[PDB]
């Protein structure tokens, strides 16, 4: 049952954007005509005649399904399979069960798309706000009902005399190829529309010297790659001379065949739609790039090396690009499972929003057991540097260093306090993770799916059981390709090589994920780590990222780094730094459907890995977790839909301004690709100094790195550390190693920690509603200037997710930047210093300030009027990890100056992930707050949408711009009472000694503080007079 559909696989090698050219028409089929093929449920079939564009007398027929996926959220889908019957994927972001759930709900509400074939055979249907017509040759126009504006239309190509063929549906004649493509008209050059294309995951694009956000006029590809520095040499265009810089034609780590098109921006006729080509073979997105003749300025397309064809058009309910993101997340949602919390993604433990330090190149837990070696460092020293210097510090990313000889799921003695491996729970021999718990820390650790194979006769149970149970990918192909063999065997296994450089390497087997049993086996391995104290998972090398290899060479031998190239191409010999693509893997798209060459599904491997970790590792083995029952995954690879397994970090970046610019753009783009919990190594991962690789990141670049990342969702300083036994990397990078900048560095981490609830509540808004945490500037509506600012201005936080504006400096040795403030609102300069002083005067939205001053010690961060933000403080005033906060560490609702006499706020509350009762049983709370000024009376109202988690400590209201009141009354189901002036005359004293029902006039910061008892949190009317 290998190759059950009888495909002839014509192409195995990577094919750059330079070699993908559907608009050349040659050997491509396109839709030429059709007849109606019936409608069942919300799915119409059209029986489409595909004609060869270059010889239209050559013709073949395939059924094409047109399916309304949501009436209310204005989305539909087009799918066909030129290779066999249309088939529902059993694994992936979009599942039939969820589509069914959506349709069932909408039907029960009376939604009627009115899907009909006209007498002429044209298909027409409506969604809430749209109407669609599809003509005989599949020509499609999507019209918005309110104004009659056509907001999307696909493309037609002419032929000499055989009629117009619609390139909206294309595939290569199977005599020649396997590729597919779909082409729209692209209005980027239209003077009024000025369409811009956004999204596409982690792709980097340079314009002049600057990395930018928008992805218009460019040819992109998804081909998950071990792309260290984002510019791997083997990924260069044909005959490329000189340095290869990160740029748009280079694949990254996450597969995101996803674009959001935004036209008429900032105007009342703005429109936005998403375009998802749901394909896990190498895919392409060309937004009008003429380079290599890959595209045409006025056309846009998506395509892929292999079928099937399955495409979603997602317009969203409300107006604005954000609404496209929320609608896309619904299609991928888990409502069909009746998730009480995790509808659009999975909630992390609170601790995931802490500051972590990772080091590649530690050599022990304790100094007392650190082996001598140039620049060697113990985990203990790192923890001391942060804690002794009073940094808010969450814990560690422990790398492959801790393993016994790169055996995943193991540790070695040096990473235990008594210098020997225990089974856990021994107070006189604690593992790195147990010891870390005692420091108030939590840890992630590096897990890949390389199971070391060259063990020189030493027992390695994980590899042994994989062999015995035959769960490893075999060495079979349809091409008779010899993938190589070692003395270790087995004789039928696919054997690869892991290479961390500097001699840190090993042979490996890999799990054949598509097999039944593999996922359960994998997940069970995590018990070996959870039972010794591991908190969460750091998933690496997920392509799987194998050492480059050429067929015929030894498994441990890599090719010359210049190979392959245009003059000496791969010709089916290169592995493209993963599985040689000929390898037969058990199908990961369709269960119990046989094996297919990996080329058909490269981009689903990392996704399937994370899925197995999540379900069979983290969830099924939750009982074996120690301190926190909720866990999480931070992954390096994945595919649309990864957000239900965990978050991401953008792989191996480096230490320059350009990587800061990239980190910001990556974060915004990933967020709009429905992966919200993402970040990039703070300070940069690899060496940057070409003359001496060991030179650390400068103090100024570090300050800017930290400032730019301090409110981004995943915040970890991690780097490659030069040590004697791994002689590549930088000397150090830890924030405490920068004495001159230490105070600034510390205060930005403190600032993040104070806004821990702003982040956590935004994550809740993602899990519940699919709202991206980080907003692209163009998500701010009715503003014709945000587009210009979108490279480095972003928003987050508050009730609506647009209460905070960030515009970090993205250049070293720079103390000014061009600032744009979104229009139709007021802004307040904020940041680390403003907790302890008054706000400055309001800044008018719409203002553009050239050379806006930004000292090194500052970053441009602004709170919008009408924000009430939940803010946290430690009771004793010392910095501690998030995971060791209790409800006795004050929760404070900070009321910023009112917008139109009003302010609003929201706070999600649960036990931080100590248990999984929030997501399993609905044990969480959602508190809302409002402030209203009505003459001489301010009313501050607390209500709840649910209150299943009881906050155990007093909470506060801090009103900015208020001082001494005549009276404050508090009404609440618990008690109705007047407040009294506190005898405490400072904040520490109000916190520690102040009585419930005290107010404190804070002159230093022009704030009024109300101390209230916990019982009044879910419901209260506070009237200040
Ligand atoms: Cl990866």
PDB file of C-alpha atoms in Angstrom, residues 350 756-757 871-873 885-893 907-911 924-925 927 947-956 1012-1018:
ATOM      1  CA  UNK A 350       1.914  31.751  33.617  1.00  0.00           C
ATOM      2  CA  UNK A 756       2.544  39.853  33.500  1.00  0.00           C
ATOM      3  CA  UNK A 757      -1.292  39.937  33.585  1.00  0.00           C
ATOM      4  CA  UNK A 871      -0.517  45.128  37.154  1.00  0.00           C
ATOM      5  CA  UNK A 872       1.442  42.949  39.624  1.00  0.00           C
ATOM      6  CA  UNK A 873       3.893  43.694  42.430  1.00  0.00           C
ATOM      7  CA  UNK A 885       3.952  34.757  43.058  1.00  0.00           C
ATOM      8  CA  UNK A 886       0.954  34.128  45.293  1.00  0.00           C
ATOM      9  CA  UNK A 887      -2.273  36.111  45.432  1.00  0.00           C
ATOM     10  CA  UNK A 888      -0.650  37.948  48.357  1.00  0.00           C
ATOM     11  CA  UNK A 889       1.536  39.690  45.775  1.00  0.00           C
ATOM     12  CA  UNK A 890      -0.699  42.679  44.963  1.00  0.00           C
ATOM     13  CA  UNK A 891      -2.952  42.725  41.916  1.00  0.00           C
ATOM     14  CA  UNK A 892      -3.491  46.386  40.947  1.00  0.00           C
ATOM     15  CA  UNK A 893      -5.882  47.757  38.346  1.00  0.00           C
ATOM     16  CA  UNK A 907      -8.055  40.311  33.628  1.00  0.00           C
ATOM     17  CA  UNK A 908      -7.996  36.557  33.274  1.00  0.00           C
ATOM     18  CA  UNK A 909      -7.235  34.740  36.556  1.00  0.00           C
ATOM     19  CA  UNK A 910      -6.337  31.125  37.318  1.00  0.00           C
ATOM     20  CA  UNK A 911      -3.804  29.259  39.465  1.00  0.00           C
ATOM     21  CA  UNK A 924     -10.711  30.220  35.892  1.00  0.00           C
ATOM     22  CA  UNK A 925     -12.074  33.736  36.238  1.00  0.00           C
ATOM     23  CA  UNK A 927     -12.854  39.937  35.614  1.00  0.00           C
ATOM     24  CA  UNK A 947     -15.433  33.578  38.624  1.00  0.00           C
ATOM     25  CA  UNK A 948     -14.377  29.980  39.174  1.00  0.00           C
ATOM     26  CA  UNK A 949     -10.927  30.902  40.456  1.00  0.00           C
ATOM     27  CA  UNK A 950     -10.953  32.819  43.750  1.00  0.00           C
ATOM     28  CA  UNK A 951      -8.222  35.445  43.990  1.00  0.00           C
ATOM     29  CA  UNK A 952      -6.957  35.025  47.567  1.00  0.00           C
ATOM     30  CA  UNK A 953      -5.404  38.413  48.325  1.00  0.00           C
ATOM     31  CA  UNK A 954      -6.512  42.017  48.438  1.00  0.00           C
ATOM     32  CA  UNK A 955      -6.465  43.888  45.118  1.00  0.00           C
ATOM     33  CA  UNK A 956      -6.062  47.600  44.408  1.00  0.00           C
ATOM     34  CA  UNK A1012      -9.974  46.434  48.559  1.00  0.00           C
ATOM     35  CA  UNK A1013     -10.696  42.971  49.978  1.00  0.00           C
ATOM     36  CA  UNK A1014     -10.575  39.940  47.678  1.00  0.00           C
ATOM     37  CA  UNK A1015     -14.324  39.200  48.001  1.00  0.00           C
ATOM     38  CA  UNK A1016     -15.295  42.433  46.218  1.00  0.00           C
ATOM     39  CA  UNK A1017     -13.249  41.605  43.074  1.00  0.00           C
ATOM     40  CA  UNK A1018     -15.935  39.725  41.095  1.00  0.00           C
TER      41      UNK A1018
END
